[PDB]
A paper describes a structure:
Formation of active [name]-1 reverse transcriptase (RT) proceeds via a structural maturation process that involves subdomain rearrangements and formation of an asymmetric p66/p66′ homodimer.
In addition, we relied on our previous strategy of deleting a disordered palm subdomain C-terminal segment (Lys219—Met230, referred to as the palm loop or PL) in order to block the metamorphic transition to p51* and, consequently, dimer formation. The fingers/palm/connection [name] contains the same palm subdomain deletion used in our previous studies of the p51 monomer. Although crystal structures were obtained for both [name] and FPC2, the FPC constructs did not crystallize readily, perhaps due to the dynamic behavior of several loops.
Author numbering: 5 to 88, 94 to 218, 231 to 240, 318 to 417
């Protein structure tokens, strides 16, 4: 076949980020996953000769029993070159929008051999029987900024048939998810989703069941600048947030009520709020905000991975 040359931004080296400790449950799940990815060729074992590292952990999506590997490529993404498909203002106007995970599609495209070293990561060892189990990718990895950009031409022709027969439908890709929206009746909308998934399945693409959304009831953007989200605790499970680019010019405000449940706390509820706000920012503007979270760094960093349910990770800072 053939790959796409890729580069880090000028003057920048690959990531050297320590692996953080994990629960035995997550370690066991990463070992099962990575064992299989290795046999399939998607990743290769490596040793300490590779000086780069990126943290890994494991998560379960909302209403799902399947562990999913999540590599926190945020540092590699900052350092990866920019790549040179505008945002659909119509998406936020649709009666219904379904979110499909298509991250499995990347694993069919090889990664430039000279870039692979930068994607190394380390599964910690249970009971310290080894110093760790290390791998690097041979294919486009989920969560890397480069993967949807390189795959895009492939994605366009995967979707050309379906779009040709359904122009009343909007399909927007952000990172590793498709956003599929229509004003159709929900029954009509839900079966068009199946139709799309059948088609993607014919291409090998399997898709975890998607989250549904209805933005038409959600109630001066400069796309060259970052979005910022601030969150405040209100008490009794309630939260407020503002999204803005210049401090006094708010573009959106809202409030978030914590998920019902016997087990809850501020960290879990914050991860819920971040995920709901990020999802809305993507549908409205196509960008994930940088979050200002009302919580101590150490507390967040100790616990947030116990509650994360998304395949992406935003930037955040603390107080």
């Amino acid at each position: 076949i053939e790959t796409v040359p890729v580069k880090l931004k000028p003057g920048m080296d690959g990531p050297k980020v320590k692996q953080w400790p994990l629960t035995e449950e997550k370690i066991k799940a990463l070992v099962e996953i990575c064992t299989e990815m290795e046999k399939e060729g998607k990743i290769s074992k490596i040793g300490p000769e590779n000086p780069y590292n990126t943290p890994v952990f494991a998560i379960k999506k909302k209403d799902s029993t399947k562990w999913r590997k999540l590599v926190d490529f945020r540092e590699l993404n900052k350092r990866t070159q920019d790549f040179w498909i505008p945002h659909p203002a119509g998406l936020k106007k649709k009666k219904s929008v379904t979110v499909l995970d298509v991250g499995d599609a990347y694993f069919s495209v090889p990664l430039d051999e000279d870039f692979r070293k930068y994607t190394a990561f380390t599964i910690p060892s249970i009971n310290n029987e080894t110093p760790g189990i290390r791998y690097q990718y041979n294919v486009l990895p989920q969560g890397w900024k480069g993967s949807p950009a390189i795959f895009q031409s492939s994605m366009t022709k995967i979707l050309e048939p379906f779009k040709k027969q359904n122009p009343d439908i909007v399909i927007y890709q952000y990172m590793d998810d498709l956003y599929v929206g229509s004003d159709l009746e929900i029954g009509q909308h839900r079966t068009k989703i199946e139709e799309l998934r059948q088609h993607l399945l014919r291409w090998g693409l399997t898709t975890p069941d998607g989250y549904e959304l209805h933005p038409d009831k959600w109630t001066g953007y400069d796309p060259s600048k970052d979005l910022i989200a601030e969150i405040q605790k209100q008490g009794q499970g309630q939260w407020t947030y503002q999204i803005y680019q210049e401090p006094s010019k708010n573009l959106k405000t809202g409030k978030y009520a914590r998920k019902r449940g016997a087990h809850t706390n501020d960290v879990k509820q914050l991860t819920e709020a971040v995920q709901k706000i990020t999802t809305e920012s993507i549908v409205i503007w196509g960008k994930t905000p940088k979050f200002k979270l009302p919580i101590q760094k150490e507390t967040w960093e100790t616990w947030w991975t116990e509650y994360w349910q998304a395949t992406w990770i935003p930037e955040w800072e603390f107080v």
